[PDB]
């Protein structure tokens, strides 16, 4: 520490690269996403850390896979946040 | 059908295929899904020669 | 930190300040309710219920599209279980330990760990039973453990 | 745990002032800490302070100067009856001339100098000088 | 010694095989589906062995239909990447399981099958009520066509293997016909319009050599067999196309299925030299103004239909109208991409790898290509 | 009606009656009636600013407040021109309670809910004034004179919806509470 540093107003990601409950306001580090690949032609919305298999109603019947954190998607783009 | 919008940029050709009755929408397909949200997750080590 | 291990750790969920909808969403309060009631039929318990909504459906959480929690919605029907799943999962574990202990009397490590999980039941029971969520005559024993988990 | 919130609070601003700082971060924000620091601000030992808001309990940030030497807590909270007062303030202050024992009374939270003019005893919280 | 090595017996020796125990075991296996750590080969084998046990005990055909649906759905889930094709050994077993499912379902007209039946409405046991089985043959056959399309996007166009996988197209066409007849008797109008689109999609590009052979032999005078006449009453691809398209135009609630049907209808008229019909349908549609806002696969179908209209005008000696229809497509220098037949190597340097991976999935199979050298020569 | 659409607020009053008449008239008119459904107010009020301009206030029964939030911009746009020269904002009215722990006498009547408490109402009022920004942060500063100034960090989208209302919203809150507020747009958005 330079022992005089500001703490009222932090840098956009040089003082918001910190742990999420050590920030001034607590934010998640997760997001939603609007998908719609071909294997299942429907506008699905899915959480980033899936935690469970997300099913498909088309020819496919799998979209995700829950790993140790985020979730590995598949061969279908479909991406957004949106906003959060 | 030009998905790139490049073929008809010349103002001389903009009206070349306009119908005399105004193009009706009864056979027009409207995509309701916002394709701006679909990102192909390239698990990004794909490479090409310099 | 930990209540029967020496450890300390952070992994807690952190909610946003906001709490609108937010805007993008559907299934009015009422839609969410019938979506839930179907799941509880299938043996999906309140913790599982919120997960299976959050992962694949448009909710952030079912506390900002309803004025109630997931459990209170089920309770108003009368379709809530007679003991909390929290208590159930403790008792569910300790029976298998006691089976393994009868099959192997030289697993002193298992015997040790049973003392912890056993005492952790009694502490939890003394929360509910003072709050009039359990009968004031109910106790935990081998016999009552067997019958109540089945 | 964090049995007493106010007691953990003052040690930060005490430690911080010694090293040479002028901004701090104190949590988790009790109303009791606010009215304490209000009285401590009037006399002039600290500057204006900003209360950040969270739903959890909030966080508070303070701007301070070298005028402060030390603020301590006294716990557990004893009673005073305006004849016990003189005995307390002798032990806890560097001088009669300045230093301020704080306390809470039914007439609100205030210094000892004010309480003597209202004829109100009460429960003692901390001190500073 | 430890008992070895009978495959782990699904039931203990002494559990009575009741319908409720089989459904409970099916739901245990189905709750294992898609989990990060389950074997998918074992999930298919465990469902096939549950069919054998269901057929040994005649536990109600509604259960047999429900487990056959879960087998076909687990065969699609065998590949965890929606963007890769199915392996031939698993593809054949999928076509077999779909035929056996259709055989059981044609034997039993009393069974109702659909998406619109909630799991709480599953009459699997009551003979005095219509059996109601939650499973949609349509979305499985729509998925079969998606897996077939991916095989024919990932085999090399010049290898003998392409001709081998194209033999299975006849079995796909037959399954879609079996499912059409079944949904004409029992289906909703929104399921019928979707099967009619799938039947149109495998017929609109095929030139009817039987209709042409029937035009090249006028019936002057040789007498053989009334049996050879009943197999000659094969309904013309043109009359079938006109019936299915008119039903879509009169019953469809979606502007998408209508838009695909009119483009396939125009393509089929244009392929058969029927220029006036193809022209008048194209002009009546006003798609020229509206297609810019339609999805890119429908734009690729429109561009292929516009090339086919230009080739149809050329076959009729209408060189001026042929030139006009082909001018914008060929003068673009991007004809291969506009027709969905590949990417141009000169544009590989300017695109994001994720967009390229989405454009590759939008390519039409090689047996749906129109030769670019034929297009440029015309 | 046009006079008895303001109960618990005193039915006669010239300005308040002249609002109600042409307000319900718009709702009855066929020009928009496919999102206007014959709601009523409960009072109204006109309050100035130090900007030298007036602004009108619309109270509602508050279960009906939710329906107003549906349209809220189109409606306010039309009434910005129809009542022109003044700013227009919706707000809600609550029946705030003294404490039983003692600011007025209790009789063990009921518990006193903590949504019917004082402080929760003054938070809820702020949520409506700048509803289209959907408040991102709140901060407060305390003065040496014991005053308090309440910073509000707003979203960095939907800026111009509130940017010409930015000062005039602050003067509303002053009259209702007795407190001073400032509105800000932050450095960064997450």
UniProtKB/TrEMBL annotation, chain B:
PTM (free text): Phosphorylated upon DNA damage, probably by ATM or ATR.
UniProt-annotated location(s): Cytoplasm
Family of this protein: Belongs to the eIF-3 subunit D family.
Function field: mRNA cap-binding component of the eukaryotic translation initiation factor 3 (eIF-3) complex, a complex required for several steps in the initiation of protein synthesis of a specialized repertoire of mRNAs. The eIF-3 complex associates with the 40S ribosome and facilitates the recruitment of eIF-1, eIF-1A, eIF-2:GTP:methionyl-tRNAi and eIF-5 to form the 43S pre-initiation complex (43S PIC). The eIF-3 complex stimulates mRNA recruitment to the 43S PIC and scanning of the mRNA for AUG recognition.
UniProt note: domains: The RNA gate region regulates mRNA cap recognition to prevent promiscuous mRNA-binding before assembly of eif3d into the full eukaryotic translation initiation factor 3 (eIF-3) complex.
Subunit structure: Component of the eukaryotic translation initiation factor 3 (eIF-3) complex, which is composed of 13 subunits: EIF3A, EIF3B, EIF3C, EIF3D, EIF3E, EIF3F, EIF3G, EIF3H, EIF3I, EIF3J, EIF3K, EIF3L and EIF3M. The eIF-3 complex appears to include 3 stable modules: module A is composed of EIF3A, EIF3B, EIF3G and EIF3I; module B is composed of EIF3F, EIF3H, and EIF3M; and module C is composed of EIF3C, EIF3D, EIF3E, EIF3K and EIF3L. EIF3C of module C binds EIF3B of module A and EIF3H of module B, thereby linking the three modules. EIF3J is a labile subunit that binds to the eIF-3 complex via EIF3B.
Name of the molecule in the record: Eukaryotic translation initiation factor 3 subunit D
Organism, as annotated: Oryctolagus cuniculus (Rabbit)
Full-protein interval shown: 52 to 101 of 557
Automatic annotation (TrEMBL), chain E:
Residue positions, PTM Phosphothreonine: 217
UniProt PTM comment: Phosphorylated. Phosphorylation is enhanced upon serum stimulation.
Region (Disordered): 215-235
Subcellular compartments: Cytoplasm
Compositionally biased region (Polar residues): 215-224
Domain of life: Eukaryota
Assembly and binders: Component of the eukaryotic translation initiation factor 3 (eIF-3) complex, which is composed of 13 subunits: EIF3A, EIF3B, EIF3C, EIF3D, EIF3E, EIF3F, EIF3G, EIF3H, EIF3I, EIF3J, EIF3K, EIF3L and EIF3M. The eIF-3 complex appears to include 3 stable modules: module A is composed of EIF3A, EIF3B, EIF3G and EIF3I; module B is composed of EIF3F, EIF3H, and EIF3M; and module C is composed of EIF3C, EIF3D, EIF3E, EIF3K and EIF3L. EIF3C of module C binds EIF3B of module A and EIF3H of module B, thereby linking the three modules. EIF3J is a labile subunit that binds to the eIF-3 complex via EIF3B.
Function of the molecule: Component of the eukaryotic translation initiation factor 3 (eIF-3) complex, which is required for several steps in the initiation of protein synthesis. The eIF-3 complex associates with the 40S ribosome and facilitates the recruitment of eIF-1, eIF-1A, eIF-2:GTP:methionyl-tRNAi and eIF-5 to form the 43S pre-initiation complex (43S PIC). The eIF-3 complex stimulates mRNA recruitment to the 43S PIC and scanning of the mRNA for AUG recognition.
Family stated for the protein in its record: Belongs to the eIF-3 subunit C family.
Name of the protein described by the UniProt record: Eukaryotic translation initiation factor 3 subunit C
Organism: Oryctolagus cuniculus
Residues of the full protein shown: 308 to 685 of 913
């Amino acid at each position: 520490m330079p022992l005089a540093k500001d703490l009222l107003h932090p840098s956009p990601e040089e003082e918001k690269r910190k742990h999420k409950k050590k920030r001034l306001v607590q934010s998640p580090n997760s997001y939603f996403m609007d998908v719609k690949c071909p294997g299942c032609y429907k506008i699905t919305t899915v959480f980033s850390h899936a935690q469970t298999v997300v099913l498909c109603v088309g020819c496919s019947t799998v979209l995700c896979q829950p790993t140790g954190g985020k979730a590995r998607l598949t061969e279908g783009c479909s991406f957004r946040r949106k906003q959060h | 059908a030009d998905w790139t919008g490049a073929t008809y940029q010349d103002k001389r050709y903009t009206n070349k295929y306009s119908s005399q009755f105004g193009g009706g929408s009864q056979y027009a397909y409207f995509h309701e899904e916002d394709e701006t949200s679909f990102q192909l997750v390239d698990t990004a080590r794909t490479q090409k020669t310099a | 930190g930990r209540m029967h291990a020496p450890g300390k750790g952070l992994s807690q969920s952190a909610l946003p300040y906001r709490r609108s909808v937010p805007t993008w969403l559907k299934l009015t309060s009422d839609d969410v309710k019938e979506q839930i009631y179907k799941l509880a039929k299938k043996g999906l318990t309140p913790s599982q219920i919120g997960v299976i909504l959050r992962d694949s459906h448009g909710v952030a959480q079912v506390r900002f599209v309803t004025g109630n929690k997931i459990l209170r919605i089920l309770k108003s029907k009368g379709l809530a279980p007679d003991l909390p799943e929290d208590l159930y999962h403790l008792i569910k574990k300790a029976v298998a330990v006691r089976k393994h202990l009868e099959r192997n009397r030289k697993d002193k490590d298992a015997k040790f760990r049973l003392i912890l999980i056993e005492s952790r039941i009694h502490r939890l029971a003394r929360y509910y039973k003072t709050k009039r969520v359990l009968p004031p005559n109910w106790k935990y024993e081998s016999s009552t453990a067997s019958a109540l988990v089945a | 745990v964090r049995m007493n919130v106010l007691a953990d609070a003052l040690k930060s601003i005490n430690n911080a002032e010694k090293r040479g700082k002028r901004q701090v971060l104190i949590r988790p924000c009790s109303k009791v800490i606010v009215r304490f620091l209000t009285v401590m601000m009037k006399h002039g030992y600290i500057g204006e302070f900003e209360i950040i808001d969270d739903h959890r309990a909030g966080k508070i940030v303070v701007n301070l100067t070298g005028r402060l030497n030390k603020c301590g807590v006294i716990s557990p909270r004893f009673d005073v009856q305006l004849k016990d007062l003189e005995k307390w303030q002798n032990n806890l202050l560097p001088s009669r001339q300045f230093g301020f024992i704080v306390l809470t009374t039914s007439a609100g939270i205030m210094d000892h100098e004010e309480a003597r003019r209202k004829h109100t005893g009460g429960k003692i919280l901390g001190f500073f000088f | 010694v430890p008992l070895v090595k009978e495959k782990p017996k699904m039931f203990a020796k002494g559990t009575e095989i009741t319908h409720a125990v089989v459904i409970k075991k099916l739901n245990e296996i189905l709750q294992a589906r898609g989990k990060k750590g389950t074997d998918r080969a074992a999930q298919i084998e465990l469902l096939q062995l549950l069919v054998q046990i269901a057929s040994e005990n005649n536990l109600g055909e509604g259960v047999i239909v429900k487990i056959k649906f879960n087998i076909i759905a687990s065969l699609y889930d065998y590949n965890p990447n929606l963007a890769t094709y199915m392996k031939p050994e698993m593809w054949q077993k999928c076509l077999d399981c779909i035929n056996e499912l259709m055989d059981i379902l044609f034997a039993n007209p009393n069974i109702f099958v659909g998406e619109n039946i909630l799991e709480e409405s599953e009459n699997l046991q009551n003979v005095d009520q219509p059996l109601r089985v939650r499973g949609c043959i349509l979305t499985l056959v729509e998925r079969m066509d998606e897996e077939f399309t991916k095989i024919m996007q990932n085999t090399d166009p010049h290898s003998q293997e392409y001709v081998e996988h194209l033999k299975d197209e006849a079995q796909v066409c037959a399954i879609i016909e079996r499912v059409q007849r079944y949904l004409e008797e029992k289906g909703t109008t929104e399921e019928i319009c979707r099967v009619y689109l799938r039947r149109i999609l495998h017929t609109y590009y095929k030139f009817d050599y039987k209709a042409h052979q029937r035009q090249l032999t006028p019936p002057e005078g040789s007498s053989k067999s009334e049996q050879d006449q009943a197999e000659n009453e094969g309904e013309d691809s043109a009359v079938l196309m006109e019936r299915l398209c008119k039903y879509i135009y009169a019953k469809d609630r979606t502007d998408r299925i209508r838009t695909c049907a009119i483009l396939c209808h125009i393509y089929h008229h244009a392929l058969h030299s029927r220029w006036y019909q193809a022209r008048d349908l194209m002009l009546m549609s006003h798609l020229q103004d509206n297609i810019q806002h339609a999805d890119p696969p429908v734009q690729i179908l429109y561009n292929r239909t516009m090339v086919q209209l230009g080739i149809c005008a050329f076959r009729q000696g209408l060189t001026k109208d042929a030139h006009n229809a082909l001018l914008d497509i060929q003068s673009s220098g991007r004809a291969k991409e506009l027709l969905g037949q590949g990417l141009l190597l000169r544009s590989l340097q300017e695109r994001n790898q994720e967009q390229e991976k989405v454009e590759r999935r939008r390519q039409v199979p090689f047996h749906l290509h129109i030769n670019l050298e034929l297009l440029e020569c015309v | 009606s046009a006079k008895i659409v303001k109960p618990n607020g005193e039915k006669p009053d010239e300005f308040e009656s002249g609002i109600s008449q042409a307000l319900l008239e718009l709702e009855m008119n066929s020009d928009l009636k496919a999102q206007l459904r014959e709601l009523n107010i409960t009072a109204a009020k006109e309050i100035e600013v130090g900007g030298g301009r007036k602004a009108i206030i619309i109270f509602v029964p508050v279960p009906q407040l939710k329906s107003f939030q549906k349209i809220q911009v189109r409606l306010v746009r039309e009434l910005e021109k129809k009542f022109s020269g003044k700013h227009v904002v919706f707000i809600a009215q609550r029946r705030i309670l003294p404490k039983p722990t003692r600011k007025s006498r209790t009789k063990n009547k009921q518990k006193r809910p903590r949504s019917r408490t004082l402080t929760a109402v003054h938070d809820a009022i702020l949520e409506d004034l700048v509803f289209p920004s959907e408040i991102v942060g709140k901060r407060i500063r305390v003065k040496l004179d014991g005053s308090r100034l309440i910073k509000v960090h707003l979203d960095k989208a939907q800026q111009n919806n509130v940017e010409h209302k930015v000062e005039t919203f602050s003067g509303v809150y002053k009259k209702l509470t007795g407190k001073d507020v400032n509105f800000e747009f932050p450095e960064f958005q997450l």
